[PDB]
């Protein structure tokens, strides 16, 4: 909220999340956020709205966004001994907000770095425009906009498989330890539903096959395989 000195403006200014409505917000370097944003985000994410009441003006702004973020582990390099909670400095409620995690590491292997350098050089000078993707950008956009016009549904076997998978995922993680492992909530089941719907959209099918449920469960489980390794 900004107001002119002895001025009757009392107007709000829009942050990046507000501008990213119906779009994708790409925040970089997530680690050094401050307390106000650090506590506003987990309200903006789950409830898709932002509420404020300061100096005589109150409003509820729409923040329907799809967030993608990047971060760096504390100490610089990911320590394989510890887990995601040990390395990252983010709070536990923020982690539950996210639906997927990807951890990527670098190494000193001589076979990989040579290929990486060769591929960098080739794109730099030789084939700066001659990359080989299977499909062009325009075709990608056409297919994406065609697939976005589908709303998949769920069948009986899909529901049974989904409840069985949720029961298994809740049970196996709770078998580890008490008061030290707490990562699975109903949000994980909703994330499974959303990911299955997205995968069904990708193949352009109005229904959902338990194979999609299995794939989503595999993704969410390897999200926990990574934290173990």
């Amino acid at each position: 909220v900004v107001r002119d000195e002895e001025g009757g403006d009392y107007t709000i200014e829009a942050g990046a999340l507000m501008l990213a409505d119906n779009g994708i917000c790409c925040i970089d370097e997530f680690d050094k956020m401050d307390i106000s944003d650090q506590v506003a985000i987990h309200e903006a994410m789950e409830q898709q709205t932002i509420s404020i009441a300061k100096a005589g003006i109150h409003a509820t702004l729409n923040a329907r966004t799809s967030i993608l973020a990047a971060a760096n582990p504390v100490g610089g390099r990911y320590n394989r001994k510890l887990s995601l909670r040990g390395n990252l400095n983010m709070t536990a409620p923020i982690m539950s907000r996210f639906d997927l995690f990807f951890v990527i590491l670098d190494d000193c292997n001589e076979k990989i770095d040579t290929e990486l350098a060769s591929h960098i050089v080739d794109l730099h000078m030789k084939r700066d425009e001659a990359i080989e993707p299977p499909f062009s950008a325009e075709q990608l956009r056409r297919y994406i906009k065609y697939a976005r016009t589908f709303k998949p549904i769920l069948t009986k076997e899909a529901r049974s498989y989904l409840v069985e998978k949720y029961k298994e995922l809740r049970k196996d993680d709770a078998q580890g330890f008490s008061r030290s492992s707490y990562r699975i909530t109903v949000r994980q089941l909703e994330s499974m539903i959303r990911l299955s719907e997205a995968i069904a959209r990708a193949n352009c099918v109005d229904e959902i096959t338990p194979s999609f449920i299995a794939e989503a469960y595999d993704l969410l489980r390897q999200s926990i395989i990574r934290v173990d390794v």
Binding site: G8, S51, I52, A53, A55, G56, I57, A92, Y182, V186
Partner: protein, 290 residues
């Protein structure tokens, strides 16, 4: 006559609002209040102006809107169940139906079970919310003793327990609801504030968040993280039901009849069952007892 801006929820992000002038004839006076989002059906008309022509250098005309109907749209965005200027008004037949269905056995159970029909379990929370939004009876003894007649409710628990969904439903169903959250609310924003009018140039009173909650419920989310200076300004609102301001030569007391429903999270993100409530949260007795 009143100034009408654009709702921040419908303006394009990062742009500037547009202002118009609305004229209210008889029976429409004082229906609208400052800071309240409204929807006005009216007639569009134009009239000549001299200075406006002088500044722009072209034959431009001013436009005003004379109101013909006003509908309040604060909080309750759900506007599909029924039509009309107001959705909280009853006909005679609806009163008859109320009396017919208010006498059956076990109506309390039906009322409790019919609240938030898409949330499983949490019977105690539903009962507490019903008892909080139905309220009690204020008491005045000989015009010299005052007893508050509204019930406050505090929620606490682990994440993923759908407290915010309950709060959203409460805001949807209440007649007068105000939503605050986390650190996004200040001490003077909830209570009344003093402001210098840019036109007449003297201090005036600006209605705060709690003032809009008169005969209603005020909802707070992330109650624990809110700073103590931003939390200690609602003690009188909870208990004394009155707001007193002595600032800039103005000494006035403002009445506030609001019920406060709050949600928070314990220390460490989870509730340690083998510890007392005093070591689970950082709140103290003066706030807990209310």
């Amino acid at each position: 006559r009143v100034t009408l801006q654009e709702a921040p929820g419908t303006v394009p992000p990062g742009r500037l609002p547009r202002h118009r002038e609305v004229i209210l004839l008889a029976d429409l006076v004082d229906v609208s209040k400052p800071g309240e989002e409204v929807e006005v059906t009216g007639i569009y008309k134009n009239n000549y102006d001299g200075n406006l022509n002088a500044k722009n250098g072209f034959p431009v005309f001013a436009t005003i809107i004379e109101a013909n109907s006003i509908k309040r749209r604060e909080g309750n965005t759900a506007n599909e169940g029924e039509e009309g200027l107001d959705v909280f008004s009853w006909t005679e037949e609806e009163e008859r139906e109320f009396r017919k269905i208010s006498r059956d056995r076990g109506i309390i159970d039906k009322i409790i079970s019919s609240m938030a029909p898409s949330i499983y379990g949490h019977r105690d929370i539903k009962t507490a919310v019903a008892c909080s939004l139905f309220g009690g009876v204020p008491k005045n003894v000989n015009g010299k003793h005052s007893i508050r007649g509204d019930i406050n409710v505090l929620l606490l628990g682990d994440p993923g327990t759908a407290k915010s969904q309950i709060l959203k439903y409460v805001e949807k169903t209440a007649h007068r609801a105000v939503f605050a959250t986390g650190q996004g609310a200040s001490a003077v924003g909830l209570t009344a504030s003093v402001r210098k009018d840019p036109i007449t140039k003297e201090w005036t009173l600006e209605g705060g968040a709690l003032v809009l909650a008169d005969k209603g419920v005020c909802l707070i989310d992330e109650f624990d993280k809110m700073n103590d200076q931003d939390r200690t300004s609602i003690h009188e609102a909870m208990e004394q039901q009155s707001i007193s301001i002595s600032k800039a030569g103005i000494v006035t007391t403002l009445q506030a009849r609001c019920s406060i429903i709050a949600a928070a999270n314990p220390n460490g993100g989870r509730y340690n069952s083998t510890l007392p409530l005093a070591q689970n949260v950082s709140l103290t007795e003066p706030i807990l007892s209310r």
